[PDB]
Amino acid sequence: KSPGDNIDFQTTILSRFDMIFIVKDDHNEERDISIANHVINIHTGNANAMQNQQEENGSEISIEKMKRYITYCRLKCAPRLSPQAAEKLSSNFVTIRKQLLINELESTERSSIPITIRQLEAIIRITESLAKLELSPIAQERHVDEAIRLFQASTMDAASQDPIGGL
Amino acid sequence: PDAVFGDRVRRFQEFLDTFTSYRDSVRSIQVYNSNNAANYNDDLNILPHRIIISLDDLREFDRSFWSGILVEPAYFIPPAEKALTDLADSMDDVPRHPWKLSFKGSFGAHALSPRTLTAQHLNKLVSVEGIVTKTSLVRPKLIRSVHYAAKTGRFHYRDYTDATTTLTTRIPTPAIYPTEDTEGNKLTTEYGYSTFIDHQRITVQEMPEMAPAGQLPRSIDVILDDDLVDKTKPGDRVNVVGVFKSLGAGGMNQSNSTLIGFKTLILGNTVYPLHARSTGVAARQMLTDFDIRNINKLSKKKDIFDILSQSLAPSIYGHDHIKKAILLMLMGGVEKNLENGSHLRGDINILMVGDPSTAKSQLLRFVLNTASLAIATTGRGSSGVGLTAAVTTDRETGERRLEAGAMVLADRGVVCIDEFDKMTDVDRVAIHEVMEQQTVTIAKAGIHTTLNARCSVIAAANPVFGQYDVNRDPHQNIALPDSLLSRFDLLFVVTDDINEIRDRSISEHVLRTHRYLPPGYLEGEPVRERLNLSLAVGGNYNGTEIPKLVTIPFLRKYVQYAKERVIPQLTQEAINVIVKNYTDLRNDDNTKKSPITARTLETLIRLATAHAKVRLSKTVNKVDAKVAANLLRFALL
Ligand SMILES: Nc1ncnc2c1ncn2[C@@H]1O[C@H](COP(=O)(O)OP(=O)(O)O)[C@@H](O)[C@H]1O
Numbered sequence: 049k050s051p052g053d054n055i056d057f058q059t060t061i062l063s064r065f066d067m068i069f070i071v072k073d074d075h076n077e078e079r080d081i082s083i084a085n086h087v088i089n090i091h092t093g094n095a096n097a098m099q100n101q102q103e104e105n106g107s108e109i110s111i112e113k114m115k116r117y118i119t120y121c122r123l124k125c126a127p128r129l130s131p132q133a134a135e136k137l138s139s140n141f142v143t144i145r146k147q148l149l150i151n152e153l154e155s156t157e158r159s160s161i162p163i164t165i166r167q168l169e170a171i172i173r174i175t176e177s178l179a180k181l182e183l184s185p186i187a188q189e190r191h192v193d194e195a196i197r198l199f200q201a202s203t204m205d206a207a208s209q210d211p212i213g214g215l
Numbered sequence: 216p217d218a219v220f221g222d223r224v225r226r227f228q229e230f231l232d233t234f235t236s237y238r239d240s241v242r243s244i245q246v247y248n249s250n251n252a253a254n255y256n257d258d259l260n261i262l263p264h265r266i267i268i269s270l271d272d273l274r275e276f277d278r279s280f281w282s283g284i285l286v287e288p289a290y291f292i293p294p295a296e297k298a299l300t301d302l303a304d305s306m307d308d309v310p311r312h313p314w315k316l317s318f319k320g321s322f323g324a325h326a327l328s329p330r331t332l333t334a335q336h337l338n339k340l341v342s343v344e345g346i347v348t349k350t351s352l353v354r355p356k357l358i359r360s361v362h363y364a365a366k367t368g369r370f371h372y373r374d375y376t377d378a379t380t381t382l383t384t385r386i387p388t389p390a391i392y393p394t395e396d397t398e399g400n401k402l403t404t405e406y407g408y409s410t411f412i413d414h415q416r417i418t419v420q421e422m423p424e425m426a427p428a429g430q431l432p433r434s435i436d437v438i439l440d441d442d443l444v445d446k447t448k449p450g451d452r453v454n455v456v457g458v459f460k461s462l463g464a465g466g467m468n469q470s471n472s473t474l475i476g477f478k479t480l481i482l483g484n485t486v487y488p489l490h491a492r493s494t495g496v497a498a499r500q501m502l503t504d505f506d507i508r509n510i511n512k513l514s515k516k517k518d519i520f521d522i523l524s525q526s527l528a529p530s531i532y533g534h535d536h537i538k539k540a541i542l543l544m545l546m547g548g549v550e551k552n553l554e555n556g557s558h559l560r561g562d563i564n565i566l567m568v569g570d571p572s573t574a575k576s577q578l579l580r581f582v583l584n585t586a587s588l589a590i591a592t593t594g595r596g597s598s599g600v601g602l603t604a605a606v607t608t609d610r611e612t613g614e615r616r617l618e619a620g621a622m623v624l625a626d627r628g629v630v631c632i633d634e635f636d637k638m639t640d641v642d643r644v645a646i647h648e649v650m651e652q653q654t655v656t657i658a659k660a661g662i663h664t665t666l667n668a669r670c671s672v673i674a675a676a677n678p679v680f681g682q683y684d685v686n687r688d689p690h691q692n693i694a695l696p697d698s699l700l701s702r703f704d705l706l707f708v709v710t711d712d713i714n715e716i717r718d719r720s721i722s723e724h725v726l727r728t729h730r731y732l733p734p735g736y737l738e739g740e741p742v743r744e745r746l747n748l749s750l751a752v753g754g755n756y757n758g759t760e761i762p763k764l765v766t767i768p769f770l771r772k773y774v775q776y777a778k779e780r781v782i783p784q785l786t787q788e789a790i791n792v793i794v795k796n797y798t799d800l801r802n803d804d805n806t807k808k809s810p811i812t813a814r815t816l817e818t819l820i821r822l823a824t825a826h827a828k829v830r831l832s833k834t835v836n837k838v839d840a841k842v843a844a845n846l847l848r849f850a851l852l
């Protein structure tokens with residue numbers, strides 16, 4: 049079935065979301081063993097000790113400290129995209145529509161998942177969100193590439209799950 | 216005679232002599248009143264005797280008197296009112312009611328809300344902004360009763376005062392209504408020689424956007440006197456300036472023995488209706504001479520229609536014909552009222568339908584922000600009684616009264632309806648009467664009323680498949696009934712067809728739009744949001760007072776001026792064009808998005824009149840008719 053055929057609501061609702069994830073049932077033995085081991089770690093209490101050790105190390109931060117940090121970065125920082133970061137977004141936005149146009153012209157059926165200007169503003173928001181982590185007033189090209197990778201990992205592979213958006 | 220009172224009177228004399236604007240304002244009121252009196256004597260309106268006083272000017276002149284006005288208004292406002300009365304009596308001797316005072320300017324810690332009003336602010340001058348929820352019946356209050364004794368043939372009188380009339384407390388001497396004279400002769404009341412001052416009480420609750428989202432709201436009663444009566448309706452956003460007073464005894468007397476506390480209210484001196492977003496108060500701007508000259512020098516140009524249109528929402532790429540339609544709707548045509556009571560529409564209705572993410576909701580939000588009286592509604596969120604009217608019961612009289620819906624509240628205004636397709640059929644057939652007859656008829660249990668609903672309507676709809684299809688029938692695409700389709704003056708289908716050059720240009724425009732910084736803002740700092748409350752009186756970033764494309768504050772000065780000033784009249788040269796185009800559209804072989812009826816002819820007349828309003832022309836010309844005709848062709852083909 050199509051991604052729009054699986055959902056019990058209108059396909060235009062999907063366009064209003066910036067990033068859509070399609071979570072899969074892998075049905076693999078080695079992944080099931082690992083996830084079962086992880087859940088048993090949580091239930092036993094080894095996960096609590098490991099998380100405390102990593103919080104002492106610093107690879108994991110505390111939840112209250114993250115909450116206060118999120119508040120601080122929300123009030124302090126509001127990044128701006130650089131002019132050299134704009135032409136790459138304008139290219140990576142128009143290539144998706146170039147693929148979508150020829151796919152929809154060949155199929156003569158409209159894709160159930162659309163790509164619109166709201167998705168461009170979504171990638172802009174992701175880019176200026178990655179720079180807000182660093183307390184960086186300027187969004188650089190290195191944030192743009194991560195934003196494109198995040199958009200590929202969420203919206204574009206879900207679009208490729210649509211046979212019309214693929215081909 | 217109190218010495219410190221006289222010293223304060225003399226100090227306010229010095230302040231009034233220093234600032235000559237108030238001296239000119241008193242004289243200007245007096246000449247208006249005397250000219251109207253002389254007109255009534257030879258062959259109308261009267262101005263009240265009160266003066267707007269700036270608190271900042273008083274602070275600069277005398278900080279002690281300014282702090283006295285704010286902190287102890289009972290000891291400082293009556294001397295200043297006495298001083299103003301002395302000045303007005305000294306100037307009005309050549310050509311009787313004592314003069315009053317109003318206050319404007321910054322209040323500092325005295326700029327409060329009904330939640331923020333506390334008992335430390337009692338006996339202080341406070342400025343309180345909120346929403347009017349309840350208003351009382353306007354009631355006359357007897358001030359002086361005049362009586363006639365027929366036995367002696369003489370007229371007697373008695374004066375009455377209450378605690379709300381004076382800022383300072385007085386010994387309460389309750390003098391009864393006299394029915395005897397001092398000798399025992401019967402008195403008859405002389406109605407019409409007695410004086411009655413209008414009195415009102417309103418309730419000001421804190422604004423629902425400035426109130427916490429879960430808590431019950433806090434409110435306060437405001438008492439208004441003769442000239443401040445009926446300056447508000449329920450639902451208005453208001454700023455009331457007045458003295459936060461305590462009255463009576465809070466149960467300390469033996470007869471009273473209860474913990475209502477001391478009853479507290481604001482003795483209002485000043486009421487400012489405020490314009491907020493999607494409210495019933497219309498936004499108005501005071502036009503200076505320089506702005507009028509700017510509007511008139513833009514009016515003589517030839518590209519003024521293509522300059523105001525592109526300057527509506529320059530942050531939206533394309534939709535150039537929709538911007539023109541929104542501008543002509545904001546002009547709004549001319550309403551005709553014939554001699555037999557028959558009414559003809561003047562305002563323009565626009566429906567937009569098409570693909571998602573095509574800036575339809577952004578255009579709706581722009582019209583909500585740029586129009587004087589725009590109200591925003593949603594499809595299923597509003598109901599039949601939500602838009603038109605409802606019937607409730609008030610506490611005092613117990614009789615049924617009306618609560619005005621969004622359409623009635625937007626009389627002579629703008630209704631922005633989002634998600635037009637998802638609306639219920641009862642509310643649809645309610646909207647059929649509003650969009651053509653421009654009235655709302657309520658026939659409920661006991662009540663039968665007709666309300667004015669003279670409105671412009673902008674609607675945003677979506678096709679039933681979610682995306683517009685070229686090969687399918689547009690009647691199948693929209694799937695809206697014929698009668699609603701005929702009501703809308705202009706219907707715009709906006710498809711999200713994608714081309715490489717167009718996607719490139721829109722991508723560059725949106726990316727360069729997201730790289731904007733407001734003036735005075737640092738690079739990393741976030742822009743703060745301040746809610747816009749404006750006082751109602753009576754893609755390039757750098758647009759600064761009509762260089763190429765006008766600013767939004769100037770554009771609504773132009774629209775306001777064109778609406779109040781020019782009333783264009785149709786002429787034969789436009790009539791021939793609209794008749795020929797209407798006949799051609801009626802007999803066209805082409806398929807159209809919108810059906811063709813006699814409503815399209817009146818749409819052509821309204822659009823020609825609206826274009827004439829843009830040019831500030833008192834006459835409708837051929838060039839107006841042709842642009843009104845080929846604007847309609849785009850919405851049809
Ligand atoms: N032609 C356009 N020009 C500029 N911005 C646009 C355009 N079309 C869409 N957008 C942007 O895409 C976002 C999606 O919202 P919107 O397009 O208003 O939704 P809808 O069209 O479904 O009402 C908006 O924030 C708007 O700024």
Ligand SMILES: [Mg+2]
Pocket residue numbers: 575576577675
């Ligand atoms: Mg929308």
